[PDB]
Amino acid sequence: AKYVCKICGYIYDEDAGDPDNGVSPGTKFEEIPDDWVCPICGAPKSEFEKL
Ligand SMILES: [Fe+3]
C-alpha cells in the first residue's frame, strides 16, 4: 500500500521502504518505528493517510 504525507505530498510506498532512514523495502507502514518521520518535511506518522 501507499501512504501520502498530508503536509508535503511525499508518498511512502511499502514496496520501496525508506532505506536511507533505516526502513527496508517491504516494511508495512504500521511496522515503521514510532519515531520515524516524513523524510521530506519531518511530519510525524500521524500526518499520513492511506491511499
Ligand atoms: Fe511530508
UniProtKB/Swiss-Prot annotation:
GO biological process: alkane catabolic process
Keyword Iron recorded: yes
SUPFAM superfamilies, per database record: Rubredoxin-like (SSF57802)
The keyword Zinc-finger appears for this protein: no
Residue ranges of every copy of the Rubredoxin-like domain listed in the record: 1-51
UniProt-annotated binding residues for Fe cation: 5, 8, 38, 41
UniProt GO MF annotations: electron transfer activity; iron ion binding
Cofactor: Fe(3+)
Keywords recorded for this protein, A-Z: Electron transport, Iron, Metal-binding, Transport
Temperature dependence: Extremely thermostable, being unaffected after incubation for 24 hours at 95 degrees Celsius.
Role: Rubredoxin is a small nonheme, iron protein lacking acid-labile sulfide. Its single Fe, chelated to 4 Cys, functions as an electron acceptor and may also stabilize the conformation of the molecule.
UniProt record similarity statement: Belongs to the rubredoxin family.
Protein name in the entry: Rubredoxin
Native species: Pyrococcus furiosus (strain ATCC 43587 / DSM 3638 / JCM 8422 / Vc1)
Lineage: Archaea, Methanobacteriati, Methanobacteriota, Thermococci, Thermococcales
Name of the coding gene: rub
